[PDB]
Swiss-Prot record:
Residues carrying sugar: N64
Localization: Secreted
Biological function: Binds to WNT proteins and inhibits their activities. May be involved in mesoderm segmentation.
Top-level taxonomic group: Eukaryota
Residue stretches in coiled coil: none
Annotated disulfide bonds: C116-C153
Name of protein: Wnt inhibitory factor 1
Description of how the protein assembles with itself and partners: Interacts with MYOC.
Domain WIF: residue ranges: 14-153
Residues of the full protein shown: 32 to 181 of 379
Length: 157
């Protein structure tokens, strides 16, 4: 509470970390989603056929995502959407964290697990959308609705 606009630490960062992409094709590819809350138009590429984001093979059980705040700025998050969309190639996506929480200044990994029901062979889809608020509950950052992935399963029972 202050002079004209001060200079303090940055806003929320969220990227899909490259370590996971190695497990996808032995090649390493990061994808920056949210940089200082100033989110890139990443959602076009995310839902478009990208080299690495949509199509996931049966072999990948889980993906990783990585996020953080800057120094004193812990953002609060809550998962609006995280669910499958298929019928035959049906699965249920899961997260390595609670459905709500905070984004910490500490670069922290969030695994996303994809147990498939192993019934029909093909490619199922799943939706994700997450909102972000300050600790009082005031919404401030919101994922745009299009973040959909595609997980290739085969029959196994």
């Amino acid at each position: 509470g202050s002079h004209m606009l001060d200079q303090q630490e940055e806003s929320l960062y969220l990227w899909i970390d490259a370590h996971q992409a190695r497990v996808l094709i032995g090649f390493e590819e990061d994808i920056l989603i949210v940089s200082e809350g100033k989110m890139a138009p990443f959602t076009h590429d995310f839902r478009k056929a990208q080299q690495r984001m949509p199509a996931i093979p049966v072999n990948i059980h889980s993906m990783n995502f990585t996020w953080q705040a800057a120094g004193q700025a812990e953002y609060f998050y809550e998962f609006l959407s995280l669910r499958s969309l298929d019928k035959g190639i049906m699965a249920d996506p899961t997260v390595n964290v609670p459905l709500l929480g905070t984004v910490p200044h500490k670069a922290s990994v969030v695994q996303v697990g994809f147990p498939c029901l192993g019934k029909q062979d093909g490619v199922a889809a799943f939706e994700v959308d997450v909102i972000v608020m300050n600790s009082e509950g005031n919404t401030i950052l919101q994922t745009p609705q299009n973040a959909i992935f595609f997980k290739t399963c085969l029959q196994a029972e």
